[PDB]
Amino acid sequence: TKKVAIILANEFEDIEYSSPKEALENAGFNTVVIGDTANSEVVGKHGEKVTVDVGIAEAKPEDYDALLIPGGFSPDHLRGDTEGRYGTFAKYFTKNDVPTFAIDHGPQILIDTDDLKGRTLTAVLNVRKDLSNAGAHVVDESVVVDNNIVTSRVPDDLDDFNREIVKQLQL
Template sequence: MSTDLEGLQVAILATDGVEQVEILEPMKALRGAGADVKVVSLKTGTIQAMNNDVEPGERITVDADLSVDPELFDALVLPGGTTNPDKLRVSEDAVDFVQHFVDNDKPIAAICHGPWMLIEADAVDGVQLTSWPSLRTDIENAGGEWVDEPCVRDGLLVTSRKPADLPEFCRQMIELFGEDADEDEEG
């Protein structure tokens, strides 16, 4: 298992309303491990991050809009914030982007409300995962098994509940992405 993610291309799918700490902390952890991280969004320019869904935070630079080829990326991060995934899940292009990672067995890390995108991409049936508690019924209705744990790993998916879980989420995300990078080198 590698925590050296040198050469790994990671997309973070986010838009206006993303929870600031849930995009910046994974980005920092991934870059610290050597990954090349790009923010992909519905639009170019910047997106407005939020603190606790109510206070505007930083503006985050977008590296690519959804016209980018998802094949360019090895892994995907889905941060939360209530409005971020709610806006993304009604975009066919955003759902198709996530679906690419699911269909091609690429690792995905999702936190808080981010698993809404996994539901839209039909990626939770038979999977154990966690999220912000209000998604429990949505996950269960989509065939997933929701558990109340700080961080849950099931196959190529790591999920977490909330910002307080970020240290464990980032550790397991890097572990998962590193394992996948090791398999690509061997395979």
């Protein structure tokens, strides 16, 4: 069975967690929350409470068949890690062409892989300039699929996002 790593800090956009999680699980895939401390709780911008399954220090990226990065301010928090561990984690996925799903602010973590040069991505308007500064070809579409990397901008994009991420994993 295929299993998706979801990297999560506080103040994630609740629905950008719950909606892709439900779409993946409905397609038969499992999901695992990776955050600072196993068994700690992170809380969405709108109060959703999620328990972290696996600590970032223990997580083995090769265990997972895809990476999901919900938006809101969770990505910004993750990029506060003094050792940059979430960028390093994401880099396994970008370096090995493993399905990598990132919505809204989620693509901010992909900047930290240094692997975006010549990749085609969208994201929330707020961060598009930083994606372009990281060398991405940035567009403004509801979903963008560049081989393994699937990106979307906002919660209104979820239908399109969800349908692409599940297709990616079916391969």
